[PDB]
């Protein structure tokens, strides 16, 4: 094994950070990016403590298709990455970079990233130390015949040179399970067998009509804890929006895949934390978001989602690291061996811990996210593990899971009930996570949670997230409900016939939109109420080390009923939010 160019794990996660080449502006001889950040100046904003665990990742999005185009590019970005010079040390830095090297099935038509040869990789990574990996992204809709052939040379050459490949897909059309060799192409299992430790795959969850969010997450988890790949993550895409054909927020009617700009703008900034929750608390530790105007930003400045949801949540789980492969593997109960595909996909989990066929998030912790693997592999490696001798392998086929209720009953009798409510609640060690498990329903959801005899009511909104961590001292609350108001976007439409009717808004016209009125002069959502009540408490709580997004807050209200030895606690925000509560039980 050649040495690792970095770590990627629990303790060492990953946020990539994408830029997009402007193929357009390259047509008239420059070189940038759309949305108008510069590799140097983004790279110069990401704060310093999240610079160990940050990657560039250059995106050839719509450079020319032909040769040369995609090279030429890529080239000039490594060489501003290698002679990058911190200003306020006066060193050479050279900053961190991820290619993008396949997409879209690399078809010429696609892609210019069709004109990159592995052998022009290999020369990359021998010329840039700070050429950490590689990344393939979204090819399930194309499925070239070839694929799994280049995916096993791009591991190799990646395992040559010590980087990564990264590999982020989504199980529409069983491409998961085609990439380790259903349908005989078996170069990328061979691959895997030799350099997973060089593999990272992630989840797309992009294609959200199609419903494959759960089961391709339950893939990706089980990949990982069965050594079939290095770690996980998931890329979570504000474009599901437009690929389900929702317009307004809580509006009715469905406007199709007709709004697209619109669209992609419009997915509430915190449910992208419920969706991150999902990588975080089953073990990923890799994460990457489009659309990267709305998420990370544009003119080398944050956008609100990224920094009050997205760059609070990857802080917190570098501060508080995910679950180990050892401690996921000692939870885990089922692991599944077989083809969602032939299941029902998505259906599979549906009224399991899915509400609806097209979602990204999940409606009960009880069973966190079952991991599974594609029945093409075998499952020799995890049953090696030390840590995997309580673990019930079940073949997917297994009458357990014939259907929704029998799914139930068998998973029921191995993972207990462990809170009350209609709400999506997880525990890990002495946290709650907690989140309102609504997409478009304006609709409260409320829980009861306990640590130990400590009982915590809690009344979210959706698009609502908490974490609930009993110290020593008494709780600490982590909430992020932040959701900007984008009914601007929608305005001049008064139901879903004149909204697919609407002008487009264009590329260039939603990027125009976040500079003039998301980056400055946002139309903020209103406050509103989250409760939190404690039951067992001896005296009124004290409250401490209060912040969150600036103006985003009332002071929280305490209500304490001697009593009944009780305490209400309402907040009214729309940010993200932390505080500590001081108190002692009652006995
Ligand atoms: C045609 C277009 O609008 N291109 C943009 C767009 O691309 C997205 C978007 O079209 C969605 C619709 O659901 O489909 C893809 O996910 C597409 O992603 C882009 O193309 C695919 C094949 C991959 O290469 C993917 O990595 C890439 O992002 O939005 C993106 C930004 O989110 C770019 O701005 C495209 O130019």
């Known amino acids: 094994e050649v040495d690792k160019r970095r770590e990627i794990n629990n303790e060492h996660p990953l946020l990539m950070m994408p830029l997009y080449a402007n193929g357009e502006e390259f047509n008239q001889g420059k070189y940038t990016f759309w949305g108008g950040d510069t590799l140097t100046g983004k790279w110069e904003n990401i704060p310093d403590d999240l610079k160990p665990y940050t990657v560039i990742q250059l995106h050839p999005d719509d450079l020319p298709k032909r040769d040369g185009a995609a090279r030429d590019f890529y080239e000039h970005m490594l060489e501003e990455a290698a002679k990058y010079v911190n200003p306020k040390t006066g060193k050479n830095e050279?900053?961190?970079?991820?290619?993008?090297?396949?997409?879209?099935?690399?078809?010429?038509?696609?892609?210019?990233?069709?004109?990159?040869?592995?052998?022009?990789?290999?020369?990359?990574?021998?010329?840039?130390?700070?050429?950490?990996?590689?990344?393939?992204?979204?090819?399930?809709?194309?499925?070239?015949?070839?694929?799994?052939?280049?995916?096993?040379?791009?591991?190799?050459?990646?395992?040559?040179?010590?980087?990564?490949?990264?590999?982020?897909?989504?199980?529409?059309?069983?491409?998961?399970?085609?990439?380790?060799?259903?349908?005989?192409?078996?170069?990328?299992?061979?691959?895997?067998?030799?350099?997973?430790?060089?593999?990272?795959?992630?989840?797309?969850?992009?294609?959200?009509?199609?419903?494959?969010?759960?089961?391709?997450?339950?893939?990706?988890?089980?990949?990982?804890?069965?050594?079939?790949?290095?770690?996980?993550?998931?890329?979570?895409?504000?474009?599901?929006?437009?690929?389900?054909?929702?317009?307004?927020?809580?509006?009715?009617?469905?406007?199709?895949?007709?709004?697209?700009?619109?669209?992609?703008?419009?997915?509430?900034?915190?449910?992208?934390?419920?969706?991150?929750?999902?990588?975080?608390?089953?073990?990923?530790?890799?994460?990457?978001?489009?659309?990267?105007?709305?998420?990370?930003?544009?003119?080398?400045?944050?956008?609100?989602?990224?920094?009050?949801?997205?760059?609070?949540?990857?802080?917190?789980?570098?501060?508080?690291?995910?679950?180990?492969?050892?401690?996921?593997?000692?939870?885990?109960?089922?692991?599944?061996?077989?083809?969602?595909?032939?299941?029902?996909?998505?259906?599979?989990?549906?009224?399991?811990?899915?509400?609806?066929?097209?979602?990204?998030?999940?409606?009960?912790?009880?069973y966190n996210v079952i991991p599974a693997i594609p029945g093409v592999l075998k499952t020799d490696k995890l049953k090696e593990s030390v840590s995997s001798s309580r673990i019930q392998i079940k073949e997917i086929t297994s009458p357990e899971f014939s259907s929704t209720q029998a799914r139930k009953e068998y998973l029921n009798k191995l993972y207990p009930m462990n809170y009350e409510g209609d709400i999506f609640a997880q525990k890990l060690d002495n946290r709650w996570f907690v989140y309102n498990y609504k997409v478009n329903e304006n609709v409260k959801q409320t829980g009861k949670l306990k640590f130990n005899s400590l009982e915590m009511n809690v009344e979210f909104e959706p698009h609502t997230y908490g974490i609930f961590e009993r110290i020593s001292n008494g709780l600490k609350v982590n909430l992020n409900n932040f959701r900007t108001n984008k009914d601007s976007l929608w305005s001049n439409a008064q139901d879903a016939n004149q909204a697919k009717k609407l002008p487009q808004l264009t590329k260039k016209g939603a990027i125009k939109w976040i500079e003039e009125h998301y980056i400055k002069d946002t139309q903020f959502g209103e406050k509103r109420v989250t409760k939190i009540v404690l039951r067992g408490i001896d005296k009124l709580p004290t409250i401490h080390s209060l912040s969150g997004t600036n103006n985003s807050y009332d002071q929280p209200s305490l209500n304490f009923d001697q009593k009944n030895h009780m305490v209400t606690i309402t907040i009214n925000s729309n940010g993200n939010l932390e505080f500590e509560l001081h108190f002692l039980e009652h006995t």
């Open 94 to 366: 050279p900053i961190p970079v991820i290619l993008t090297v396949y997409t879209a099935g690399n078809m010429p038509y696609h892609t210019s990233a069709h004109w990159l040869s592995t052998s022009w990789i290999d020369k990359m990574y021998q010329k840039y130390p700070n050429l950490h990996g590689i990344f393939s992204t979204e090819s399930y809709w194309i499925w070239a015949n070839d694929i799994e052939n280049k995916a096993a040379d791009y591991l190799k050459v990646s395992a040559k040179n010590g980087g990564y490949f990264i590999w982020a897909e989504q199980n529409s059309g069983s491409a998961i399970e085609k990439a380790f060799g259903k349908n005989g192409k078996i170069a990328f299992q061979k691959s895997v067998d030799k350099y997973w430790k060089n593999l990272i795959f992630m989840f797309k969850n992009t294609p959200a009509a199609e419903g494959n969010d759960s089961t391709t997450e339950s893939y990706m988890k089980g990949l990982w804890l069965s050594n079939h790949t290095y770690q996980w993550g998931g890329l979570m895409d504000t474009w599901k929006w437009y690929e389900t054909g929702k317009w307004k927020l809580f509006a009715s009617g469905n406007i199709g895949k007709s709004q697209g700009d619109r669209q992609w703008l419009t997915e509430p900034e915190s449910m992208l934390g419920e969706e991150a929750l999902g990588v975080y608390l089953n073990g990923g530790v890799v994460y990457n978001f489009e659309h990267p105007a709305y998420t990370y930003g544009v003119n080398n400045k944050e956008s609100l989602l990224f920094s009050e949801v997205i760059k609070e949540f990857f802080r917190y789980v570098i501060a508080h690291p995910a679950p180990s492969k050892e401690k996921v593997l000692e939870d885990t109960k089922v692991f599944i061996h077989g083809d969602y595909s032939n299941k029902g996909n998505g259906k599979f989990f549906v009224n399991v811990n899915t509400d609806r066929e097209q979602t990204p998030l999940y409606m009960t912790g009880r």
